[PDB]
Amino acid sequence: ARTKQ
Amino acid sequence: VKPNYALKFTLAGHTKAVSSVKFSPNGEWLASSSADKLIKIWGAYDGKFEKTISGHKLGISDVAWSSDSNLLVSASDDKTLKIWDVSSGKCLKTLKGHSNYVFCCNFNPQSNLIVSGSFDESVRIWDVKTGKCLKTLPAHSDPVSAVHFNRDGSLIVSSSYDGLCRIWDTASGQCLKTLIDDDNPPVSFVKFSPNGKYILAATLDNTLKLWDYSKGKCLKTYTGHKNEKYCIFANFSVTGGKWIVSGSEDNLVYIWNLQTKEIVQKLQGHTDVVISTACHPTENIIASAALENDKTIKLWKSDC
C-alpha cells in the first residue's frame, strides 16, 4: 500500500 | 498575509499507517483509509469518530467521495475498488479488473464514473451504477500513483513512477498530452486545480510543480519540504488565503503561498511522515495523517 515504499 | 493553523483535534483509531484523508464535499465528514484495511468516518469540525467501514481484504491506499457526499470509493492492495454507501455502510459494488494493487481513485464530478490507477500500470474507468469496467487505458510503464478528473469530467490526469503525467480523453481513451520537465523522477501525485486550468504534480525529488497542462508549461515550483519516497498528496487551499498544502517526510505539514511560492507555515506534531493532507471545502481547516509510527490524524484550524 501507499504506507510502504 | 500568512495563515495561523493551530492544532485542534487529534484522531486515534487506525491500527496501522493511515494512507489518505478526504473531506466530504458537503463539509460534514472526514474519511480516512489505512493499511489496517479500514475506512473510518469522522466529524469534520469536532473530529468525533462516527463509524468504521470494513470489507477490503488487504490495505487501502486511497478513498474518495462522490460529489453529493453519499458514496465513497476505495482502492486496495486486494486489487479491487469498492463503492460504499456511507449512510448504510453497505458495499454497493466491488470493482474487479486490475491485475495488481489498486493505488488511487476518484469519482468524476457527476459521480457516474470512477477512475482508478494501479501497480498494473493501467488507468481504468468504471461505471458507478453497474460496477463494471468500461475502459482500460495502457497508461504508463510503471505503477500509477494518482488519477483525477478535471472540472467537467472530460479529461483524466494520471501520474506514474515512470516519470510522466498524462492527460486522457475520458470518452475515447486517447492520450492527449504527456508532461515531463528537465529531469525524470517518479511522479508521486497529481491533480487538477479547482478552476481546472492547472495541474499540481509532486515528484520524488522534493518538488511540487504547478503546470498549465494546455500549454504544457511549468508555471510554479514549491520546494522546502522532504519527499523522496512516499506518494504524498498535495492540495489547493481556497477558503482563505490561496495556498498549496502538502505533507512531508520530515513529519511536518507545509503550506506555501500559491503565487509567491514562499513557505508561509509549517505544522509540527506528527511523529512520522505526513502522507496525506486535505483542505475543508468551506472552513479554513486542514486534516493531516501520518505513517505507522504515528497512526493519527490531526485537524488544524486557521483564522485565514
UniProtKB/Swiss-Prot annotation, chain B:
WD repeat windows: 13-52, 55-96, 98-138, 139-178, 182-223, 226-266, 269-303
Biological process according to GO: gluconeogenesis; negative regulation of transcription by RNA polymerase II; positive regulation of DNA-templated transcription; positive regulation of gluconeogenesis; regulation of cell cycle; regulation of cell division; regulation of DNA-templated transcription; regulation of embryonic development
Cross-link Glycyl lysine isopeptide (Lys-Gly) (interchain with G-Cter in SUMO2) per UniProt, renumbered positions: 16
SMART domains the record matches: WD40
Keyword annotations of the record: Acetylation, Chromatin regulator, Host-virus interaction, Isopeptide bond, Nucleus, Repeat, Transcription, Transcription regulation, Ubl conjugation, WD repeat
Known outcome of mutating residue 233 to A: Strongly reduced affinity for histone H3. Significant decrease in interaction with KMT2A
Location of the protein in the cell: Nucleus
Mutagenesis or variant effect for residue 103 to L: Strongly reduced affinity for histone H3
Impact upon substituting residue 178 to M: Found in a patient with childhood apraxia of speech; uncertain significance
GO CC entries: ATAC complex; histone acetyltransferase complex; histone methyltransferase complex; mitotic spindle; MLL1 complex; MLL1/2 complex; MLL3/4 complex; NSL complex
Residue positions, PTM N6-acetyllysine: 82
Consequence of substituting residue 103 to D: Strongly reduced affinity for histone H3
Matching InterPro entries: G-protein_beta_WD-40_rep (IPR020472), WD40/YVTN_repeat-like_dom_sf (IPR015943), WD40_repeat_CS (IPR019775), WD40_repeat_dom_sf (IPR036322), WD40_rpt (IPR001680)
Entry similarity comment: Belongs to the WD repeat WDR5/wds family.
Record-given protein name: WD repeat-containing protein 5
Origin organism lineage: Eukaryota, Metazoa, Chordata, Craniata, Vertebrata
Gene: WDR5
